[PDB]
Amino acid sequence: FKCVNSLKEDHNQPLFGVQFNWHSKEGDPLVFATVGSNRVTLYECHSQGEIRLLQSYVDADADENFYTCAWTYDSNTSHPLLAVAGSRGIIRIINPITMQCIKHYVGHGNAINELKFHPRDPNLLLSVSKDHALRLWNIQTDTLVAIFGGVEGHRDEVLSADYDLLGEKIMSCGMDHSLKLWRINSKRMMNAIKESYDYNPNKTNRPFISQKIHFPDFSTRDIHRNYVDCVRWLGDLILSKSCENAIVCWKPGKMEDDIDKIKPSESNVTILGRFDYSQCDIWYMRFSMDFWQKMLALGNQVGKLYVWDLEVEDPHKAKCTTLTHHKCGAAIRQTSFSRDSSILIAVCDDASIWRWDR
């Protein structure tokens, strides 16, 4: 990777999120979204390092602060869609062509820290909240499918979550130091999703009933000793980080325990490796993977990038490379690889954007 360009957004506030559109069409340029201040902005990547500015959505509320974005597509038309959310606790579904807000969702109106789309169903949107809960939405029928909470759920802000390969289960994490597993392939949850698709408020009298899921299928506080701010599945394994200069690769149970045989009472975890780095000991820093999960990237609080090659026989054998530029000195909150892994974008606390090409 070589640094080919940079720019800075005019608001001078942190860029909290960046996402390439992995649903961009054949023959079209690569496009990414950034979120920070009260805005979302789209850019196109072009030759000779060009980062072409397109158009923003700016929230009507000057005090909104967007924290997260995620791409999907319209399941009927195929056109890409962009979901954004943050401090106001309002999910906005944005038409990226025109930057129009198509529709919006409110749960209880508390800050949303992350959004994720289901890997198999483009209508299923997961939000994680300052109010300690996760929420699963069906953005086709505009229904709240389930709330994941209760006293056995998270006890402080939820900071991150991720679906596994097939979207059968979710791992969440947050300020309570815990990582929690929630199965969504239970008979109850499969039925709830089916019912959400059958719901049309114009054709019935009932409100749509959301599931209240009050018991995770696994929980641990044994991986990290501070706020857990990023989690991703790697097959049946988990990658997660806190502010302790480490991404830990771990699994529930003992070494030979099948993820799908793990009981809610499971008291053990197995550590398969740990990727250490430097100067990333502030809260709220995300790592990202490429589409194929061959590579892992994380920025630190002084503008350095770490990239791990995961194409090795066991997690602890990952090969690290580092990327620095003398002008890039601000904290990198998130990175995003293009779908083909040819471009890596980093976004920063000073509203700067850095493009690395290979």
The answer to whether residue 64 forms part of the interface with ligand 82G (CB under 6 A) is no
Q: Which of 64, 157, 162, 176 is the binder for ligand 82G (CB under 6 A)?
A: 157
**14 or 167: CB nearest ligand 82G:** 14
Q: Which of 3, 9, 14, 231 is the binder for ligand 82G (CB under 6 A)?
A: 14
Supply the minimum distance, in Å, between the C-beta of residue 16 and ligand 82G: 4
Supply the minimum distance, in Å, between the C-beta of residue 265 and ligand 82G: 29
Give the dihedral of Cα atoms 333, 337, 342, 348; nearest 10 deg.
-20
**Binding residues among 178-237 for ligand 82G as defined by CB under 6 A:** 229-230
Say how far apart CA 249 and CA 237 lie, in whole Å.
7
**131 or 157: CB nearest ligand 82G:** 157
Task: Write the binding mask 327 to 356 for ligand 82G: x where contact by CB under 6 A, - elsewhere.
Answer: ------x-----------------------
The answer to whether residue 80 forms part of the interface with ligand 82G (CB under 6 A) is no
CA Rg value for the chain? 20
Say how far apart CA 334 and CA 297 lie, in whole Å.
9
Amino acid at 102: I
**# binding residues, ligand 82G (CB under 6 A):** 13
**130 or 251: CB nearest ligand 82G:** 130
Say how far apart CA 160 and CA 157 lie, in whole Å.
9
Supply the minimum distance, in Å, between the C-beta of residue 282 and ligand 82G: 8
Token pair 């899921």 is at which residue?
213
Give the dihedral of Cα atoms 237, 308, 331, 235; nearest 10 deg.
-20
Give the full edge-to-edge strand order of the sheet including 66-73. 66-73, 80-86, 90-95, 100-106
* 99 secondary structure, DSSP code: T
**115 or 230: CB nearest ligand 82G:** 230
The answer to whether residue 131 forms part of the interface with ligand 82G (CB under 6 A) is no
Check: CB of residue 168 under 8 Å from CB of residue 184: yes
Instruction: Return all residues near 209 (Cβ < 8 A) that are at least 6 apart.
Output: none
**Binding residues among 246-285 for ligand 82G as defined by CB under 6 A:** 284-285
Say how far apart CA 19 and CA 22 lie, in whole Å.
9
The answer to whether residue 286 forms part of the interface with ligand 82G (CB under 6 A) is yes
Contact residues: ligand 82G, CB under 6 A: 14, 16, 67, 113, 157, 159-160, 229-230, 284-286, 333
